[PDB]
Symmetry: D2
Subunit: 118 residues, 4 copies
């Protein structure tokens, strides 16, 4: 349950995460399989923090989409089953860019993602 | 709309964001006014990314609570009003640590926060 | 804290709730101040249930928009302050209609609303 | 994609929904497989509205838990695949009862559920 490594989710997206430092911080790269405009998809950086001591840590990360003005955050927990298989159970918020504060109500989508190791 | 500086929210929490780098990455600290167990609250680190080009950027950040096994992620947009006042409109997910995957359904809280500058 | 009566929220929307029955069921109407296409807004029906015994009951309701294929659900709690003023604190999910299951990930928005009496 | 009938979800919960009327309104009964205190689980009524014309309608419903002061709302869309199999793709908010308005921030959980016909 070090987030380091390569993962895929139920939508077919993949992400790679680099070494987790002593503070639990990590960087990585996210390839979404889906977007509002999938023709525009490019690789997008992520940055987050996990807990370090827990065997099944909670964590969060931000994805700065490099092809959109939007941002997504993911949070979840890494679980290990009887056979040692890891799953990241996550929920996310996807924030759209709107023109002014009077449109704020329409700007936040929610969903889930389950990730397993590639 | 650089997130650098000190901010307070509607619950009375305060966060301090350091320099935003050329990628839009930032670190800082978060002092929550509230918690499951407020007697345990300690200053906690945050790490996130904002968009750089946009005058009213979207952003995300993760708070690793230093007194809990939980994690929060925030995402939102920084708006500049006609008088130049900045407001962060955010939504958040708070992930609790549970014992095993059968409890995953109970583990994610959602809410909002509006921040203005200190 | 009977939801019967007229209420307004922070976005300026108004809803009117009819008699709450002995099960806590209620119907009413909802006039949203905002929409994807505000030129199309029409008064829309709502249907929900509140708890009956509690002085500060939790509740939920569904709004079937009469001008959209979307649906919103609201859930929250009615609080009575020390002066007897009632506030509904709510969160909502707004479900859009998409063409097929491959688009399901894009279809759910989240937000808040605070209501007070008219 | 009439919600009428018997359904189960990914957590093992079941629900039965009665006839949907001409306004799209329906009642039913929900048996959750999980709860904060599963020893207390009893059958709980639901009340909601679906859209009528759409082949793959959106909908919402409220579950008034009969063993808790909490309430859940579900919203989603009913999809039909090439072989005629129905799936309800839903997101939910679970509202807890808290003592006063200053605890409101902790009171709303979010998640998903996928339902198929029994
Ligand atoms: O499309 C985008 C950017 C890419 C988002 C991919 C999401 S992240 C949650 C989910 N999990 C995945 O692995 N991938 C999806 N942004 C966007 C979408 C819609 C709108 N809009 O205005 O409707 C604006 C920006
Ligand atoms: O209490 C905690 C850790 C601190 C969370 C503070 C939240 S972050 C969203 C909101 N905005 C703020 O400025 N402050 C609040 N975690 C926690 C809470 C509940 C449970 N639980 O099991 O119920 C477990 C851990
Ligand atoms: O616009 C709509 C229908 C009206 C929704 C009003 C929302 S209910 C939550 C909030 N509280 C209020 O009082 N009013 C707002 N639906 C819609 C919106 C966006 C999209 N979309 O595709 O982006 C599709 C349908
Ligand atoms: O436990 C409860 C009542 C039952 C909730 C069942 C949920 S509905 C979303 C999900 N889908 C299912 O089919 N079943 C689950 N309420 C509750 C839970 C936690 C707390 N709390 O304070 O932590 C208070 C009330």
């Amino acid at each position: 349950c070090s987030l380091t490594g390569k993962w895929t989710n139920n939508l077919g997206s993949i992400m790679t995460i680099r070494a987790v430092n002593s503070r639990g911080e990590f960087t990585g790269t996210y390839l979404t399989a889906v977007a509002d405009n999938p023709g525009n998809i490019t690789l997008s950086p992520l940055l987050g923090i996990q807990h370090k001591r827990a065997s099944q840590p909670t964590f969060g990360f931000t994805v700065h989409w490099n092809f959109s003005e939007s941002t997504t955050v993911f949070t979840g927990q890494c679980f290990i089953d009887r056979n040692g298989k890891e799953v990241l159970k996550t929920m996310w918020l996807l924030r759209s860019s709107v023109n002014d504060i009077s449109y704020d109500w329409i700007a936040t989508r929610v969903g889930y993602n389950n990730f397993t190791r590639l």
